[PDB]
Structures are given as structure tokens and as C-alpha cells.
Amino acid sequence: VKPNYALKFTLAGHTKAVSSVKFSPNGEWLASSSADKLIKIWGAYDGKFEKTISGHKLGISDVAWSSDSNLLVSASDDKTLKIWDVSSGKCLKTLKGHSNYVFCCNFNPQSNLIVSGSFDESVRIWDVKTGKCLKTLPAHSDPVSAVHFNRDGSLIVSSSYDGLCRIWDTASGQCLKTLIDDDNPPVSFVKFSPNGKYILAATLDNTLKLWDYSKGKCLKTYTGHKNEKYCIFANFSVTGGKWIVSGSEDNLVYIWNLQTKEIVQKLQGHTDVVISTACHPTENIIASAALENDKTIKLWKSDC
Amino acid sequence: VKPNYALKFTLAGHTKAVSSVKFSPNGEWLASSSADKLIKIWGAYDGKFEKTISGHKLGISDVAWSSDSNLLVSASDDKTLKIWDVSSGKCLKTLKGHSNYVFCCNFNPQSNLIVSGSFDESVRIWDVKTGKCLKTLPAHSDPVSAVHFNRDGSLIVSSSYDGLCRIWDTASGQCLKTLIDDDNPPVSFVKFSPNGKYILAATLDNTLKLWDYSKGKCLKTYTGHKNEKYCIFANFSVTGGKWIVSGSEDNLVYIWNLQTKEIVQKLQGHTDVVISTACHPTENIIASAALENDKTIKLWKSDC
Ligand SMILES: *S(=O)(=O)c1cc(C#C)cc(CN2CCN(C(=O)c3ccc4c(c3)ncn4Cc3ccccc3OC)[C@H](C)C2)c1
Ligand SMILES: *S(=O)(=O)c1cc(C#C)cc(CN2CCN(C(=O)c3ccc4c(c3)ncn4Cc3ccccc3OC)[C@H](C)C2)c1
Ligand SMILES: [Cl-]
Ligand SMILES: [Cl-]
């Protein structure tokens, strides 16, 4: 009924704060993005450094994989996203059009679109083929913290420091829903669950929440961790037991029982804020990454 | 504790026996193969016809989708497999290689390989892009009934009327595991559990078996139905309750509790052997198809 994640590998190479870590859909790779303007690719099972991807002028806030594990998309302070062919390292497109820091990016499932969120308070939908920007949405009244497509690409969920999550219609560009609770703390992270039916949202009041999308109703909450300042990713972990996983400003990775909401494990080991965590698509592996006073990435494995 | 599948739509069009129905991964469509040498596509939620896809001689034992819901593969009595662009009907490749009927086929989760079984006793790994066999395996000492990739694509499971299931390494082709019970009744159908950790095998002694294939031990047995002749598809249902779902030669769809092995629902309405059943990816929806004297497809929905 509890997991037993244990540190197995530690992966150093970034010269500044790590901003995001993502496993690839095929289970083979980890991608990490840093304030140092670099993407590094690491063996997902052994931590073996693999290669560095370069080309952003300023720091990178976020990276994301395409469905086939062959592309990355990066979001940088340089106001652009870049689309990368991971095997060649070649930068295929640079998406230009945001007027400030791009904070968050994601592919849709079909992987012919990219969605991005910016300090400029907009959400833009792009063509991964042509690089052209297909839509700009006046999404929020503060910086956008996350953007995620749902399981068939028809919906986008965004979150903002303005305290809202919104669900947008991909084709039409129309705001279909605005999620609000009793209070409106800034929302630092949002994503759909794999089956498209729930939304996991993190707010800068030391709180994660699970929303039923179609009823716009909040089902569970998870607390015990520290999150008042940074956009700390949250994950569904589903390959063994059923957990939520999140970084934390007290340097620990928290893991909660999905259903009870009870904290079941606190992974001790990093030395600065744990900004990002990722869950391996098929194995009970967790990756964690920390900020400036640490710069390392950590691989944990559990029996469930 | 018990489902409540009810009939919602009946789908008529095939002029001979239906051989297999499969929902598309994006939840949107249903394909059907037939001894009438056609494939038909139907909307998955309302049953509306879509289009027909012709070009086989001798009729189609099996049809399988690709990961993005864009390509079909189909194993035909004309000794060949054919990969179809679902949007244009156009046959994109005519996989030639087998020396007898092609009975079963499937994409790997990456959808750059296609696996296939045949009356000729051999499994072939094809290449989607080039349409050339990459490996021919001396799979079995009788016709092979089913071939299936597991979740992470690293294994192929196959069953045969020789009474064996075998696990193949996708990369090397090597046989890693042969499963045999106390007897060896012909194995009419096999597939991996959706997490790839287990195997569900149907044998022509009216029996379904859940197999842990590494240990090589049978874990659970499901009887109550009739299956002595036909390669009848079985499935795991996991969108609501956890069930095993299978057709039956007494024209009923059998549903068992995954753990207890008890029958929880028999669906009446078909008038000939229920050859094929398929579970919807996101909703508690079941599709079932019958042989020649019935010729229809039925859609059933359940609350749990
Ligand atoms: S709801 O019924 O109220 C509800 C509430 C709560 C709580 C608290 C939890 C759930 C859990 N479900 C199931 C898991 N899930 C998914 O969106 C989901 C995740 C991953 C999925 C998936 C659905 N379908 C396929 N996959 C991929 C996968 C992963 C591991 C092994 C196999 C596999 O696919 C074969 C939600 C959290 C809702 C429901
Ligand atoms: S083994 O540990 O001994 C064993 C034995 C028996 C018996 C009898 C049953 C099981 C059940 N488990 C889990 C279910 N399962 C899967 O193949 C499977 C797991 C997770 C899946 C899935 C299939 N499809 C989607 N997902 C993700 C998902 C979807 C919906 C809800 C939850 C969810 O993940 C939490 C096998 C039968 C093995 C094990
Ligand atoms: Cl994600
Ligand atoms: Cl199944």
C-alpha cells in the first residue's frame, strides 16, 4: 500500500538551475532543461549522459517530447520556442511571436501542433511542420504557468498566476471552461490526466488539487509540501500503485496515495528546491531535478 | 461489483461473416474485417457508417489499428497483409511474404513494426515504411492464431493450434519463453495485459487463462462459455470495473470478474457465434461481432 522509491543514480552536467525533466514516451530517455540555455539527454534507466542540445540565447523554462520520442520542444526566455530533432540535434524550427518569456510548452498527441504559454499572458498554438503560429488566445491576465493538451488534442488546459485554469477548444480557439474554487491562489501548474477526465493543478498555497473536468468540481487535495514561489510540476504515477508526485521547496519529493491523499513517501537527497519531477511511462522510476544550489538530477526506483 | 452493459446500436452492412472488430486508440472509430474481403469503419459512439475499404482477395480474418489512429493493417486469406491509410482508403503497402493465409496482425506501440501470424506456421515482423519482412520466425508446429506486441514493444506473444504460446524478442527475434500447461489444447487467441505484464490465452477446451509469462505460471482461469473451434478474441476491460470480456460459440458475450473468475454478465442479442469483442479505450463501451448467420456488429454501454 506504500512505495519504496530509493535513490539509484545522480546525474550532473548542468551548470545552473534545472527547470524541467521529462521522460520520453518510449521510456528510453530523460530530457532536462536548465537556466544555462542547455537541454541534456540522459539514459532513462542508467542516468548515462547522452548528449547536449544547444541554440537558445537565454534560459529554458520547459522542454517536452513528441509522441514518437523523436522531437523536443523547448520554451526559452529568448521569447521563442525551438523544435529539435533529438537524434541529429538539429533545430528544425524556431517559433517566434511571443513578446516575452515563454514559460511552458507541449505537443499534442498527434504531435502536429505545439501549445505554449508566456509571461505575455497569451497561449499560442503552432504548426510543428511550418513553424507558423496558428492561433493566439487572450488567455489570462497574468503570466501563464502551464499548458497541456488532452488525450485527443481537442482541448487545452492552461493555468495562470491570475488564479485561473481554463480549458480551451483547440479547433475554435474558444474558452470552454474556467475553473475556480473557494479561493484563487496563483495556479503554478496544470495538466490533464491520461484519460482526459481529470485535471491536476498546483497552486502557490502549498496545495495540489484534482479536478473533475466535465463537472468542474474539485475531488481531492494533497498537502504537506512547500510550494509558495516556484512552478513545481506534479505527476500522475500509475505504473505501480497510484500516486501523485511533486517537487517541493523544502528539497524533498513528495508522493501521495492518489485516492486517500495521505503522504506515503518523502524522497530525501537534493540540496535546493525540487522544481521538477517526471514519472517513467512503463516503470516505477521517478526523476527529480533541483535549482541553483544543487544543479543535479536524481533517479529513484520503487517496487511499486 | 457487477456491470450493466445494455445494447445501444446494431450495425449491419457486411454481407458475410465478420471476423474482428477493433476500436481505434483515439476512441473515435471502430473497424471491422469480414470474409466478404472488406473493412468498414463506423463511428464508435453512435454507430454511424463511415466508409468501406476494398482491395483484398479472399477475405479478411483480422484488422488492427496503429498508435495514432491513422493506419489499418489487415491479415487476409490472399496470403498478404495490407496497410491502409484510414483517411483515403488507399492501400499503402501490400506486405507479401507469407506462403498461406494470414490470420492475425497487429502494430507495435511505436507503429513502425507490424507483426503477423499465418496458417503457414510462421510469424513475420514487417517494416511499415518499406513493407519488407525483417524477421521470419519458425514460430509454431501448426497455424498461429494470434500475435500481439506488449506495452513497451519489446516482446511479441504468439499462440497457435499447436497448443503453445511463445514470447519473442522484437529486437533479436529470439524465443524467450514457450508456455505449456498440463495439457496443450490448441491456443486460439492470446494477448498481453494492457500494462504488458501478463498474458491472456484462449484454448479450444472452452477456457481462458491469465498467464504470468516470466514465471511461466497460470494465475487465473475463466470458464462458463463455449469455445471449441473458432479464434475468438478476448479482452481486458479496465475503464470501469475490471473484467475479462470474450465472445462465445453460444452467441453470447461473456464478462467475468478479473479477480474472482466469476461470470458477471452474459449479453444476449447476437444470433451466431460471437467471433470478436473489443473494449473502448476511454468509455465503458463493448463492440461485438458475429459470424455468417448473424453478420451484425453490436455496441453495448455500461454505467460501470
Ligand atoms: S474517478 O473515477 O472519480 C477517479 C478518481 C481518482 C482519485 C482520487 C482516480 C481515478 C483513476 N483513474 C484511472 C487513472 N487515470 C487516468 O487518467 C489514466 C492514466 C493512465 C492511463 C489511462 C488512464 N489509460 C491508459 N493509461 C496508460 C497506462 C499506464 C500504465 C499502465 C498501463 C497503461 O495503459 C495500458 C485517472 C487518474 C483516472 C479515477
Ligand atoms: S499480479 O500482480 O499477480 C495480478 C494478478 C491479477 C489477477 C487475478 C490482477 C492484476 C491486475 N493488474 C492491474 C491491471 N492490469 C493491467 O494490465 C493494467 C494496469 C493498468 C492499466 C491498464 C491495464 N490499462 C490502463 N491502465 C492504467 C489505468 C487505467 C485505469 C485505471 C487505473 C489505471 O492505472 C492505475 C493487470 C491485470 C495487472 C495483477
Ligand atoms: Cl506530461
Ligand atoms: Cl484488452
XYZ file of C-alpha atoms and ligand atoms in Angstrom:
688
model
C 0.000 0.000 0.000
C 3.148 2.286 0.112
C 6.031 2.568 -2.377
C 9.773 2.218 -1.648
C 11.499 4.594 -4.042
C 15.263 4.529 -3.491
C 17.921 6.758 -4.981
C 19.791 4.829 -7.676
C 21.593 7.388 -9.852
C 22.630 11.054 -9.731
C 23.131 12.961 -12.975
C 25.310 16.128 -13.049
C 26.208 18.248 -16.051
C 24.005 21.329 -15.871
C 25.920 24.427 -14.777
C 22.833 26.239 -13.468
C 19.318 25.622 -12.189
C 17.437 22.738 -13.811
C 13.943 23.892 -14.882
C 12.218 20.718 -16.144
C 12.701 16.956 -16.578
C 10.653 14.735 -18.944
C 10.894 11.035 -19.785
C 10.371 10.227 -23.402
C 7.156 8.401 -24.408
C 9.242 5.344 -25.424
C 10.825 5.058 -21.921
C 14.348 5.386 -23.251
C 15.431 8.943 -22.461
C 15.317 11.744 -19.935
C 15.400 15.361 -21.177
C 16.328 18.111 -18.731
C 16.264 21.865 -19.402
C 18.254 24.475 -17.446
C 18.747 28.158 -16.836
C 22.166 27.562 -18.530
C 20.324 27.574 -22.010
C 21.004 23.835 -22.496
C 18.942 20.679 -22.985
C 20.711 17.492 -21.820
C 19.562 13.978 -22.741
C 20.238 11.167 -20.312
C 19.702 7.431 -20.330
C 16.369 6.865 -18.605
C 17.382 3.581 -16.899
C 21.090 4.178 -16.053
C 21.411 8.001 -15.957
C 24.179 7.842 -18.534
C 24.660 11.273 -20.022
C 23.954 11.094 -23.720
C 24.296 14.489 -25.455
C 23.698 18.244 -25.187
C 21.336 20.290 -27.346
C 22.212 23.975 -27.785
C 20.859 27.037 -29.538
C 18.704 29.052 -27.155
C 20.092 32.548 -26.410
C 18.642 32.780 -22.845
C 17.477 30.252 -20.248
C 14.974 27.464 -20.904
C 11.937 27.029 -18.675
C 10.455 23.831 -20.115
C 11.003 21.030 -22.613
C 8.570 18.454 -23.976
C 8.644 15.318 -26.107
C 6.680 14.449 -29.189
C 4.574 11.238 -29.225
C 7.215 9.205 -31.088
C 10.099 10.347 -28.786
C 11.879 11.907 -31.818
C 11.221 15.642 -31.268
C 11.707 18.024 -28.382
C 10.148 21.441 -27.996
C 11.794 23.988 -25.685
C 10.449 27.238 -24.188
C 13.026 29.966 -23.502
C 13.427 33.407 -22.017
C 14.548 34.423 -25.531
C 10.879 34.738 -26.344
C 10.946 31.687 -28.652
C 10.261 28.001 -28.744
C 12.607 25.733 -30.693
C 11.702 22.322 -32.201
C 14.572 19.812 -32.009
C 15.327 16.555 -33.805
C 16.800 14.676 -30.850
C 18.937 12.201 -32.796
C 20.596 14.754 -35.089
C 20.480 17.622 -32.536
C 19.334 19.779 -35.436
C 16.977 22.635 -34.538
C 14.134 22.176 -37.027
C 12.002 25.258 -36.301
C 12.083 28.332 -34.099
C 8.639 29.565 -33.120
C 8.608 33.345 -32.837
C 5.736 35.511 -31.779
C 5.512 35.607 -28.032
C 6.551 39.064 -26.826
C 8.166 37.903 -23.575
C 9.420 34.841 -21.695
C 7.928 31.563 -22.872
C 7.339 29.536 -19.674
C 5.634 26.306 -20.761
C 5.265 24.182 -23.908
C 3.687 20.899 -25.007
C 2.971 18.793 -28.099
C -0.478 17.473 -28.802
C -0.808 13.701 -29.127
C -0.857 13.746 -32.969
C 2.298 15.864 -32.494
C 1.452 18.166 -35.413
C 0.721 21.061 -33.021
C 2.543 22.756 -30.183
C 0.961 24.823 -27.397
C 2.959 27.387 -25.424
C 2.278 29.746 -22.522
C 4.076 33.027 -21.956
C 4.828 35.732 -19.427
C 2.960 37.859 -22.083
C -0.294 36.258 -20.679
C -1.119 34.539 -24.019
C -1.368 30.929 -25.156
C -0.261 30.285 -28.743
C -0.933 27.213 -30.897
C 1.677 26.429 -33.508
C 2.243 24.265 -36.562
C 5.211 21.957 -35.885
C 5.620 21.473 -39.659
C 5.688 25.076 -40.957
C 6.564 26.821 -37.665
C 3.695 29.247 -38.270
C 1.597 30.442 -35.326
C -1.946 29.269 -35.949
C -3.721 30.976 -33.034
C -3.057 33.432 -30.222
C -5.525 33.331 -27.331
C -6.022 36.218 -24.801
C -5.852 33.519 -22.250
C -5.094 35.192 -18.949
C -4.447 38.465 -17.127
C -1.108 37.303 -15.661
C 1.741 35.042 -16.797
C 0.742 31.565 -17.992
C 2.336 28.773 -15.890
C 1.366 25.571 -17.784
C -0.320 24.376 -20.964
C -1.376 20.806 -21.608
C -3.310 19.082 -24.353
C -5.830 16.334 -23.507
C -5.754 12.752 -24.776
C -7.071 13.559 -28.256
C -5.728 17.099 -28.711
C -9.235 18.651 -28.809
C -8.771 20.536 -25.531
C -6.021 22.620 -23.966
C -5.872 23.345 -20.250
C -3.905 26.427 -19.166
C -3.148 27.887 -15.757
C -2.017 31.354 -14.717
C -0.697 33.280 -11.747
C -4.045 35.015 -12.178
C -5.562 32.108 -10.103
C -7.491 30.510 -13.022
C -7.316 27.304 -15.056
C -9.072 27.480 -18.395
C -9.978 24.744 -20.869
C -9.764 25.919 -24.462
C -11.202 24.426 -27.633
C -8.243 23.626 -29.887
C -10.002 23.977 -33.225
C -12.121 27.031 -32.423
C -9.881 28.881 -30.008
C -12.771 29.306 -27.633
C -12.669 29.321 -23.860
C -14.872 26.397 -22.879
C -14.405 26.474 -19.146
C -12.932 28.443 -16.249
C -12.095 26.526 -13.085
C -12.452 28.287 -9.719
C -12.675 27.082 -6.127
C -13.306 28.931 -2.847
C -10.062 30.865 -3.146
C -7.941 31.870 -6.151
C -4.254 31.369 -5.256
C -1.984 31.652 -8.302
C -2.012 28.381 -10.253
C 1.548 27.271 -10.930
C 0.927 24.035 -12.829
C -1.932 22.267 -14.609
C -2.286 19.091 -16.720
C -4.989 16.657 -17.841
C -4.845 13.053 -16.680
C -4.124 10.485 -19.411
C -7.818 9.542 -19.864
C -8.708 13.264 -20.319
C -11.278 13.263 -17.490
C -9.436 14.932 -14.580
C -7.134 17.922 -14.211
C -4.226 18.100 -11.752
C -3.459 21.649 -10.634
C -0.827 23.058 -8.300
C -1.337 26.412 -6.575
C 1.198 28.598 -4.777
C -0.531 27.917 -1.440
C 1.180 24.575 -0.703
C -1.722 22.736 -2.315
C -2.306 20.387 -5.231
C -5.880 19.654 -6.368
C -7.512 17.067 -8.668
C -10.490 18.419 -10.640
C -13.219 16.556 -12.429
C -13.149 18.317 -15.801
C -16.742 17.746 -17.030
C -18.307 18.755 -13.647
C -15.701 21.444 -12.922
C -15.647 20.069 -9.363
C -12.595 19.590 -7.127
C -12.352 15.920 -5.970
C -9.129 15.639 -3.923
C -6.429 17.798 -2.409
C -2.848 16.999 -1.450
C -0.809 18.923 1.072
C 2.144 18.639 3.397
C 4.703 20.062 0.966
C 6.138 23.544 0.477
C 5.161 25.431 -2.663
C 4.777 29.198 -2.440
C 7.003 30.551 -5.179
C 8.130 28.158 -7.914
C 6.232 26.385 -10.702
C 6.774 22.832 -9.447
C 5.447 20.117 -11.787
C 3.121 17.418 -10.495
C 2.633 13.956 -11.892
C 0.311 11.041 -12.053
C 2.293 7.916 -11.213
C 0.353 4.875 -12.364
C 2.792 2.121 -13.344
C 2.682 0.523 -9.908
C 0.485 1.846 -7.183
C -1.475 5.026 -7.794
C 0.307 8.180 -6.582
C 0.644 11.885 -7.098
C 4.284 13.078 -7.161
C 5.610 16.618 -6.841
C 8.744 18.598 -6.106
C 8.814 20.851 -3.072
C 10.576 23.974 -1.802
C 11.823 22.054 1.271
C 14.131 19.984 -1.056
C 12.022 16.732 -0.908
C 9.999 14.806 -3.493
C 6.532 14.177 -2.067
C 4.439 11.128 -3.050
C 0.775 10.817 -2.072
C -1.724 7.996 -2.267
C -3.870 9.127 -5.181
C -7.134 8.126 -3.519
C -6.617 8.688 0.216
C -4.433 11.798 -0.262
C -2.097 10.590 2.518
C 1.595 11.264 2.022
C 3.263 7.892 1.628
C 6.912 8.768 0.889
C 9.303 11.751 1.115
C 12.432 11.279 -1.011
C 15.369 12.948 0.733
C 18.534 13.857 -1.105
C 18.606 17.082 -3.090
C 20.034 20.337 -1.729
C 17.918 23.081 -3.364
C 14.288 23.426 -4.374
C 12.933 20.417 -6.271
C 11.476 22.268 -9.247
C 10.517 19.311 -11.432
C 9.682 15.607 -11.392
C 8.736 13.111 -14.086
C 7.329 9.571 -13.929
C 8.566 6.901 -16.309
C 5.855 5.795 -18.771
C 6.162 1.996 -18.034
C 8.443 1.529 -14.976
C 8.356 2.589 -11.342
C 11.085 5.189 -11.923
C 10.880 8.856 -10.773
C 13.234 11.607 -11.947
C 13.719 14.740 -9.807
C 15.660 17.979 -10.558
C 16.720 20.905 -8.300
C 17.572 24.581 -8.516
C 20.777 26.656 -8.394
C 22.328 25.363 -5.127
C 22.139 21.735 -6.378
C 22.105 21.541 -10.242
C 21.776 17.692 -10.087
C 19.054 15.306 -11.272
C 18.047 12.192 -9.364
C 16.698 8.772 -10.414
C 14.649 6.775 -7.927
C 13.167 3.288 -8.344
C 10.449 1.558 -6.379
C 8.962 -1.947 -6.258
C 5.542 -0.479 -6.928
C -19.303 -5.361 -8.265
C -21.288 -6.162 -11.460
C -21.545 -4.284 -14.771
C -24.752 -3.461 -16.638
C -23.913 -3.448 -20.348
C -27.022 -2.780 -22.451
C -27.411 -2.857 -26.218
C -27.368 0.574 -27.850
C -26.665 0.099 -31.563
C -26.671 -2.719 -34.096
C -24.562 -2.298 -37.222
C -25.370 -4.130 -40.426
C -23.507 -3.993 -43.682
C -21.050 -6.822 -44.064
C -22.508 -9.394 -46.461
C -20.533 -12.273 -44.949
C -19.199 -13.231 -41.525
C -17.483 -10.521 -39.509
C -14.005 -11.653 -38.397
C -12.896 -8.970 -35.929
C -13.717 -5.520 -34.550
C -11.215 -3.111 -33.038
C -11.714 0.300 -31.575
C -9.309 2.995 -32.679
C -6.963 4.276 -29.938
C -8.334 7.774 -30.135
C -11.724 6.373 -29.074
C -13.398 7.717 -32.221
C -13.867 4.828 -34.610
C -14.458 1.094 -34.924
C -13.017 -1.050 -37.706
C -14.400 -4.460 -38.787
C -12.927 -7.167 -41.000
C -15.021 -9.744 -42.848
C -14.866 -12.858 -45.022
C -16.513 -10.506 -47.582
C -12.977 -9.093 -48.282
C -13.925 -5.633 -46.929
C -13.093 -3.387 -43.996
C -15.729 -0.976 -42.758
C -15.306 1.976 -40.435
C -18.114 3.038 -38.093
C -18.354 5.881 -35.617
C -17.608 4.441 -32.205
C -20.206 6.301 -30.153
C -23.274 6.444 -32.445
C -22.618 3.552 -34.863
C -22.933 5.694 -37.991
C -21.348 4.095 -41.040
C -18.273 5.868 -42.420
C -16.635 4.253 -45.409
C -15.589 0.961 -46.925
C -12.042 -0.092 -47.742
C -11.584 -2.637 -50.538
C -8.647 -4.335 -52.221
C -8.243 -7.773 -50.738
C -8.945 -11.053 -52.428
C -10.225 -13.984 -50.319
C -11.435 -12.091 -47.261
C -10.042 -10.676 -44.061
C -9.524 -12.662 -40.851
C -8.156 -9.686 -38.841
C -7.745 -5.908 -38.676
C -5.547 -3.773 -36.369
C -5.110 -0.036 -35.806
C -1.889 1.985 -35.417
C -0.979 4.135 -32.398
C -2.187 7.431 -33.893
C -5.469 6.068 -35.336
C -4.379 6.699 -38.921
C -3.295 3.364 -40.419
C -5.000 -0.010 -40.528
C -3.304 -3.333 -41.103
C -5.335 -6.416 -42.183
C -4.441 -10.124 -42.495
C -6.141 -11.720 -45.485
C -6.790 -15.128 -46.977
C -4.949 -13.961 -50.105
C -1.668 -14.670 -48.228
C -0.942 -10.912 -47.879
C -1.208 -8.136 -45.299
C -2.150 -4.605 -46.398
C -1.553 -1.277 -44.598
C -4.322 1.261 -45.279
C -4.342 4.991 -44.869
C -7.607 5.257 -42.983
C -8.430 8.692 -44.405
C -8.135 7.824 -48.124
C -8.875 4.101 -48.226
C -5.769 3.750 -50.395
C -3.667 0.670 -49.739
C -0.166 1.994 -48.946
C 1.671 -1.341 -48.910
C 0.882 -4.970 -49.724
C 3.069 -6.928 -47.302
C 3.957 -10.073 -49.314
C 5.949 -12.828 -47.657
C 3.690 -15.440 -46.067
C 3.064 -18.643 -48.013
C -0.512 -19.242 -46.750
C -3.482 -17.401 -45.246
C -2.666 -14.536 -42.885
C -4.803 -14.986 -39.758
C -3.717 -12.299 -37.250
C -1.873 -8.971 -37.269
C -1.028 -6.025 -35.008
C 1.050 -2.862 -34.795
C 3.732 -2.411 -32.213
C 3.168 0.550 -29.895
C 5.710 2.619 -31.859
C 3.828 1.657 -35.069
C 6.909 1.202 -37.212
C 6.616 -2.578 -36.956
C 3.721 -4.885 -37.859
C 3.528 -8.429 -36.564
C 1.594 -11.195 -38.323
C 0.681 -14.870 -37.925
C -0.362 -17.318 -40.661
C -1.628 -20.802 -41.437
C 1.949 -21.336 -42.658
C 3.122 -21.571 -39.001
C 5.443 -18.556 -39.147
C 5.352 -15.103 -37.508
C 6.804 -12.205 -39.527
C 7.897 -8.792 -38.239
C 7.312 -6.373 -41.091
C 8.528 -2.807 -41.633
C 5.713 -0.280 -42.036
C 7.820 2.171 -44.082
C 9.407 -0.312 -46.501
C 6.890 -3.154 -46.214
C 9.564 -5.834 -46.144
C 9.705 -8.638 -43.633
C 12.576 -8.009 -41.207
C 12.464 -11.364 -39.404
C 10.721 -14.637 -40.148
C 10.291 -16.760 -37.069
C 9.771 -20.576 -37.078
C 7.002 -19.758 -34.679
C 4.974 -22.943 -34.405
C 4.330 -26.567 -35.466
C 0.715 -25.537 -36.576
C -1.207 -22.394 -37.690
C -0.700 -19.342 -35.496
C -3.964 -17.794 -34.185
C -2.766 -14.504 -32.663
C 0.216 -12.130 -32.485
C 0.482 -9.201 -30.064
C 3.075 -6.644 -29.028
C 3.289 -5.753 -25.347
C 3.142 -2.240 -23.906
C 6.833 -1.257 -24.220
C 7.119 -3.035 -27.643
C 9.997 -5.292 -26.554
C 8.043 -8.563 -26.807
C 5.719 -10.391 -29.202
C 3.372 -13.063 -27.849
C 2.008 -15.711 -30.220
C -0.374 -18.646 -29.856
C -1.023 -21.499 -32.224
C -3.166 -24.537 -32.756
C -0.004 -26.434 -31.762
C -1.065 -25.699 -28.164
C 1.725 -23.242 -27.302
C 2.141 -19.583 -26.515
C 5.572 -18.203 -27.253
C 7.206 -14.908 -26.283
C 9.578 -13.413 -28.864
C 12.168 -10.617 -28.504
C 11.242 -7.886 -31.008
C 14.895 -6.834 -31.467
C 16.623 -10.246 -31.781
C 13.705 -12.480 -32.822
C 14.864 -14.982 -30.227
C 12.296 -17.119 -28.493
C 12.421 -16.164 -24.835
C 9.534 -18.267 -23.479
C 7.299 -21.165 -24.509
C 4.244 -21.633 -22.301
C 2.683 -25.090 -21.928
C 0.157 -26.272 -19.342
C -0.590 -29.775 -18.095
C -2.224 -30.498 -21.383
C -1.730 -28.488 -24.564
C -5.115 -27.817 -26.146
C -4.864 -25.609 -29.248
C -4.369 -21.946 -28.358
C -6.946 -19.962 -30.403
C -6.108 -16.495 -29.091
C -3.519 -14.724 -26.997
C -2.743 -11.202 -25.951
C -0.773 -9.202 -23.402
C -2.422 -7.423 -20.491
C -2.589 -3.703 -21.244
C 0.326 -2.996 -18.834
C 2.260 -5.722 -20.717
C 2.929 -7.708 -17.516
C 0.607 -10.645 -18.145
C -0.922 -12.743 -20.904
C -4.479 -13.840 -21.569
C -4.755 -17.090 -23.524
C -7.848 -18.764 -25.000
C -7.828 -22.517 -25.686
C -10.282 -24.712 -27.535
C -11.244 -26.514 -24.363
C -13.680 -23.693 -23.541
C -11.054 -21.978 -21.380
C -9.382 -18.572 -20.848
C -6.205 -18.401 -18.754
C -4.361 -15.476 -17.242
C -0.643 -16.202 -17.559
C 2.312 -14.674 -15.738
C 4.711 -15.422 -18.535
C 8.068 -14.776 -16.862
C 7.470 -17.243 -14.004
C 5.559 -19.269 -16.584
C 2.599 -19.894 -14.270
C -1.127 -19.721 -14.921
C -2.766 -17.352 -12.430
C -6.497 -17.457 -13.164
C -8.901 -19.476 -15.299
C -12.258 -18.344 -16.775
C -14.830 -20.881 -17.918
C -18.561 -20.872 -18.449
C -18.640 -20.120 -22.148
C -18.223 -22.249 -25.230
C -15.111 -22.111 -27.423
C -14.042 -25.286 -29.238
C -13.492 -24.284 -32.813
C -13.077 -20.553 -33.502
C -10.354 -17.996 -32.795
C -12.479 -15.797 -30.502
C -10.940 -12.524 -29.303
C -10.810 -11.782 -25.584
C -10.059 -8.507 -23.869
C -9.383 -6.858 -20.529
C -11.917 -4.162 -19.638
C -10.443 -1.532 -17.327
C -12.229 1.760 -17.992
C -14.710 0.955 -15.207
C -14.822 -2.350 -13.349
C -12.008 -4.845 -14.049
C -13.400 -7.613 -16.266
C -12.402 -10.198 -18.807
C -14.595 -9.922 -21.934
C -14.967 -12.598 -24.622
C -17.291 -13.857 -27.326
C -18.617 -17.391 -27.304
C -19.926 -20.003 -29.713
C -23.337 -19.941 -27.984
C -23.816 -16.377 -29.420
C -23.378 -14.656 -26.020
C -20.749 -12.120 -24.897
C -19.248 -13.343 -21.613
C -17.958 -10.907 -18.954
C -16.025 -12.186 -15.949
C -14.728 -10.509 -12.835
C -10.963 -10.284 -13.356
C -10.032 -11.433 -9.852
C -12.820 -13.752 -8.668
C -13.188 -15.510 -12.083
C -16.989 -15.307 -11.741
C -19.314 -14.584 -14.649
C -20.956 -11.202 -14.110
C -22.890 -10.691 -17.331
C -23.861 -12.528 -20.492
C -25.017 -10.279 -23.318
C -27.875 -11.694 -25.446
C -28.820 -10.487 -28.873
C -26.455 -11.988 -31.371
C -27.748 -14.963 -33.325
C -24.487 -16.708 -34.392
C -21.048 -17.287 -32.929
C -19.737 -14.137 -31.309
C -16.317 -14.152 -33.020
C -14.833 -10.870 -31.742
C -15.230 -8.376 -28.917
C -13.389 -5.119 -28.254
C -13.291 -2.672 -25.322
C -13.363 1.052 -25.842
C -10.211 2.933 -24.773
C -11.883 5.608 -22.582
C -15.550 4.618 -22.064
C -17.376 1.509 -20.774
C -18.366 0.519 -24.307
C -18.140 -3.014 -25.813
C -18.240 -3.858 -29.525
C -19.147 -7.405 -30.587
C -19.427 -9.075 -33.996
C -20.940 -12.386 -35.116
C -20.352 -14.979 -37.852
C -22.231 -15.601 -41.123
C -25.770 -16.383 -39.909
C -25.859 -13.060 -37.915
C -23.419 -10.707 -39.768
C -24.022 -7.643 -37.481
C -21.914 -5.607 -35.023
C -23.394 -4.584 -31.676
C -22.442 -1.681 -29.384
C -23.167 -2.062 -25.679
C -22.669 0.579 -22.994
C -22.446 0.143 -19.230
C -22.565 2.556 -16.297
C -19.590 0.866 -14.551
S -12.894 8.955 -10.811
O -13.440 7.637 -11.041
O -13.558 9.597 -9.696
C -11.229 8.681 -10.290
C -10.781 9.250 -9.109
C -9.459 9.074 -8.709
C -8.956 9.638 -7.490
C -8.543 10.085 -6.481
C -8.611 8.311 -9.505
C -9.043 7.742 -10.689
C -8.062 6.951 -11.516
N -8.394 6.907 -12.943
C -7.535 5.953 -13.661
C -6.156 6.503 -13.960
N -6.350 7.743 -14.697
C -6.053 8.013 -15.968
O -6.397 9.087 -16.465
C -5.237 7.068 -16.805
C -3.845 7.038 -16.648
C -3.021 6.263 -17.447
C -3.634 5.528 -18.456
C -5.016 5.558 -18.659
C -5.824 6.353 -17.849
N -5.349 4.740 -19.734
C -4.202 4.252 -20.138
N -3.122 4.669 -19.420
C -1.712 4.321 -19.668
C -1.146 3.190 -18.840
C -0.319 3.402 -17.739
C 0.169 2.333 -17.007
C -0.141 1.046 -17.377
C -0.935 0.808 -18.479
C -1.428 1.876 -19.211
O -2.237 1.767 -20.301
C -2.428 0.464 -20.846
C -7.060 8.782 -13.933
C -6.266 9.226 -12.720
C -8.422 8.235 -13.576
C -10.362 7.930 -11.074
S -0.344 -9.895 -10.436
O 0.142 -8.787 -9.634
O -0.442 -11.120 -9.653
C -2.030 -9.525 -10.840
C -2.978 -10.527 -10.754
C -4.297 -10.280 -11.079
C -5.299 -11.308 -11.014
C -6.138 -12.123 -10.876
C -4.662 -8.989 -11.494
C -3.723 -7.979 -11.596
C -4.167 -6.612 -12.045
N -3.069 -5.777 -12.544
C -3.536 -4.416 -12.836
C -4.375 -4.349 -14.090
N -3.608 -4.940 -15.183
C -3.227 -4.320 -16.305
O -2.744 -4.930 -17.254
C -3.436 -2.839 -16.409
C -2.890 -1.968 -15.446
C -3.050 -0.595 -15.530
C -3.757 -0.115 -16.630
C -4.287 -0.962 -17.611
C -4.121 -2.343 -17.514
N -4.934 -0.211 -18.593
C -4.778 1.029 -18.203
N -4.054 1.174 -17.056
C -3.824 2.432 -16.359
C -5.091 2.661 -15.569
C -6.322 2.766 -16.213
C -7.492 2.893 -15.494
C -7.443 2.920 -14.118
C -6.239 2.809 -13.445
C -5.068 2.664 -14.168
O -3.834 2.538 -13.591
C -3.769 2.747 -12.181
C -3.242 -6.342 -14.951
C -4.495 -7.189 -14.858
C -2.396 -6.381 -13.701
C -2.402 -8.253 -11.261
Cl 3.183 15.370 -19.327
Cl -7.666 -5.902 -23.748
